[PDB]
């Protein structure tokens, strides 16, 4: 499946909004830079920054920075949503050359490009479509993902429509979370 459903991505040519979350010599997931609380933050899956191993550093095209005591905006412990929001300083974004790509409103059927890999230096990408379920917090996507891709944003030509969190049916359909609804509806400015 590697090479057929996925296509190699040129290091340095990958989305400047995507970053790889590394735990020692192994990657624990993927994340992206976006505005949720009002300033700037790192969006990723819940497990990666909670259940998985301790995030030691972030890697972007070989460039890797150490992860310190960064305040977390909010992260639901639910397995369905499974998302985490970390508030990373601004002097860290430039160290990796990360831009803030905003998430927009998803659609019934939009084109998406999923990026993932064993490391930031060995990136690959898939291609699929994203759809919306009856529940405004659940998104369905066919984008071919692999193990350790959790946290990869659904990149579209219009922007980010959602984030890969898991799958509906193994080998059939995947599952993504609609951050748009969680950002302006579920998340409050009190927590």
């Amino acid at each position: 499946v590697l090479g057929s459903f996925y296509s190699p991505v040129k290091a340095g040519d990958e989305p400047a909004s995507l970053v790889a979350i590394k735990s020692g010599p192994t990657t624990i997931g993927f994340g992206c830079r976006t505005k949720i609380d009002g300033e700037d933050c790192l969006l990723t899956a819940h497990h990666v920054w909670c259940n998985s191993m301790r995030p030691t550093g972030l890697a972007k095209a070989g460039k890797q920075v150490s992860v310190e005591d960064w305040e977390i905006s909010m992260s639901s412990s639910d397995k369905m949503l499974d998302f985490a929001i970390v508030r990373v300083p601004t002097h860290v974004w430039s160290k990796l050359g990360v831009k803030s790509t905003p998430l927009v409103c998803p659609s019934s059927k939009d084109v998406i490009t999923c990026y993932g890999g064993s490391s930031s230096d060995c990136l690959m990408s898939g291609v699929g479509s994203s759809s919306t379920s009856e529940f405004t917090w659940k998104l369905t996507h066919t984008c071919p993902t692999a193990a350790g891709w959790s946290g990869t944003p659904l990149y579209s030509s219009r922007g980010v429509v959602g984030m890969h969190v898991g799958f509906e049916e193994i080998g059939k359909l995947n599952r993504g979370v609609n951050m748009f609804y969680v950002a302006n509806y579920l998340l409050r400015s009190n927590e």
Partner: protein, 57 residues
């Protein structure tokens, strides 16, 4: 009865305030007959458990 409580109170999250409040598309996800999740523009109530106060994870 089941009525909304004034903002003068600390925290109040009842399914009623979410049955209706955002009347456009209020989420409807139920499971086990004991738990049900609900969504809204001014509410955040969702716990598919027995305690309904987040005692699973």
């Amino acid at each position: 009865g089941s009525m909304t409580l004034p903002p003068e109170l600390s925290i109040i999250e009842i399914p009623f305030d979410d049955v209706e409040t955002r009347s456009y598309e209020f989420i409807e996800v139920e499971i086990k007959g004991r738990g049900k999740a609900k969504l809204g523009k001014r509410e955040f109530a969702w716990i598919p458990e027995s305690g309904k106060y987040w005692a699973d994870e």
